[PDB]
Design an enzyme around this catalytic site. Structure first.
Site, PDB file in Angstrom:
ATOM      1  N   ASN A  85      48.131  32.900  45.299  1.00 21.68           N
ATOM      2  CA  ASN A  85      46.688  32.884  45.098  1.00 21.68           C
ATOM      3  C   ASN A  85      46.173  31.972  43.992  1.00 21.68           C
ATOM      4  OD1 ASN A  85      47.443  36.168  45.738  1.00 21.68           O
ATOM      5  ND2 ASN A  85      46.147  35.033  47.181  1.00 21.68           N
ATOM      6  N   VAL A  92      42.572  30.379  39.826  1.00 18.95           N
ATOM      7  CA  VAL A  92      43.063  31.617  40.415  1.00 18.95           C
ATOM      8  C   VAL A  92      41.940  32.336  41.153  1.00 18.95           C
ATOM      9  CG1 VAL A  92      42.639  32.937  38.312  1.00 18.95           C
ATOM     10  CG2 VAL A  92      44.279  33.785  40.012  1.00 18.95           C
ATOM     11  N   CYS A  93      42.286  32.936  42.288  1.00 20.32           N
ATOM     12  CA  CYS A  93      41.322  33.636  43.132  1.00 20.32           C
ATOM     13  C   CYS A  93      41.400  35.150  43.041  1.00 20.32           C
ATOM     14  CB  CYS A  93      41.519  33.230  44.593  1.00 20.32           C
ATOM     15  SG  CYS A  93      41.395  31.465  44.893  1.00 20.32           S
ATOM     16  N   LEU A  94      40.233  35.780  42.963  1.00 24.24           N
ATOM     17  CA  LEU A  94      40.132  37.230  42.882  1.00 24.24           C
ATOM     18  C   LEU A  94      38.758  37.604  43.433  1.00 24.24           C
ATOM     19  CD1 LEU A  94      42.250  39.143  41.753  1.00 24.24           C
ATOM     20  CD2 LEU A  94      41.008  39.141  39.575  1.00 24.24           C
TER      21      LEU A  94
END
Lengths: 157, 157
Positions: A85, A92-94
């Site tokens: 991710n 960074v992905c969230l």
């Protein structure tokens, strides 16, 4: 016209300094004149104990836009990390880091850093940000974990 | 007669054939293969006119080969970037930038089926392509035949 963002960020810095999870680092960078640049923070996330990330200290930069907190900060690992991710750019992905998803004013820097820490050993395989780590994770889990452990040792303090 | 720019602007099987018997060389000659993004663009535009008919199939395959041979054989060409951007433009991998993923993956899949069997194709890319073509996706499910075909071919790489 970033006065609102600055007001909140000054309080978030004070809150973080007052209490934050052990091992984590989150500090505003400095402007050339020596003053704090509350819109650009240098952070560090420790690998979770009991996981292949243990022992590692992963540095990332948190960048806030002028319209913060309407928008979430942009978080980028420096250098970029091997993880399903994390984009090759380091971003960074969230879900909580996406304005059109779970980002809301109630989200804190502590929540973001803890969220990213959790993501480390618990990737969202359905939504990869890089082809490399995703491919290895899915095709050879043992090899994936080996690469993760090597990276953790590489970034050990 | 026709020209490469007009073909790329408004791709059609007929326009490709109108480029002449040397169309494959022309597409490669007129594409800036030093830019992965432009190579992805040319690859997708050329593959978009794929038809399971002798003359068109040959023209598309030959053009893909000339283009990709020229791109891949450059020691400076980043094959990983090409693959990543191809997946992004095919709507199989997300990106930080906004892109207009093509509507029909039939041609691209059939072109890839041919490409991965060629000597110029870096085999290291096969596992990554496989991972993203096997990953669930509505667009791919709409082109089951081409998808199954490409996967069966990838198993043989």
């Amino acid at each position: 016209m970033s006065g609102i963002a600055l007001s909140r960020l000054a309080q978030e810095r004070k809150a973080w300094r007052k209490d934050h999870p052990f091992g984590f680092v989150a500090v505003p960078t400095k402007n050339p004149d020596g003053t704090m640049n509350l819109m650009n923070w240098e952070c560090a996330i420790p690998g979770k104990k009991g996981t292949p990330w243990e022992g590692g200290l992963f540095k990332l930069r948190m960048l806030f836009k002028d319209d913060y907190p309407s928008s979430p900060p942009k978080c980028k690992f420096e250098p970029p990390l091997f993880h399903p991710n994390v984009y090759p750019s380091g971003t960074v992905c969230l879900s909580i880091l996406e304005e059109d998803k779970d980002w809301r004013p109630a989200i804190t820097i502590k929540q973001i850093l803890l969220g990213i820490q959790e993501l480390l050993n618990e990737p969202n395989i359905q939504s990869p940000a890089q082809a490399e780590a995703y491919t290895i994770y899915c095709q050879n889990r043992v090899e994936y974990e080996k690469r993760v452990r090597a990276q953790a040792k590489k970034f050990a303090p | 007669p026709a020209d490469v720019s007009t073909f790329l602007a408004f791709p059609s099987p007929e326009k490709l054939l109108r480029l002449g018997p040397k169309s494959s060389v022309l597409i490669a000659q007129q594409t800036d293969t030093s830019d992965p993004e432009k190579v992805v663009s040319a690859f997708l535009k050329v593959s978009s006119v794929f038809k399971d008919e002798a003359t068109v199939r040959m023209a598309v395959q030959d053009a893909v080969d000339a283009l990709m041979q020229k791109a891949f054989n450059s020691s400076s060409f980043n094959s990983n970037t090409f693959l990543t951007r191809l997946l992004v433009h095919m709507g199989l991998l997300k990106s930080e930038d906004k892109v207009k993923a093509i509507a029909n993956l039939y041609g691209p899949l059939m072109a890839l089926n041919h490409m991965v069997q060629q000597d110029y194709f870096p085999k290291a890319l096969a596992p990554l392509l496989l991972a993203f073509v096997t990953k669930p996706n509505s667009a791919l499910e709409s082109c089951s035949f081409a998808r199954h075909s490409l996967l069966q071919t990838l198993y043989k790489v």
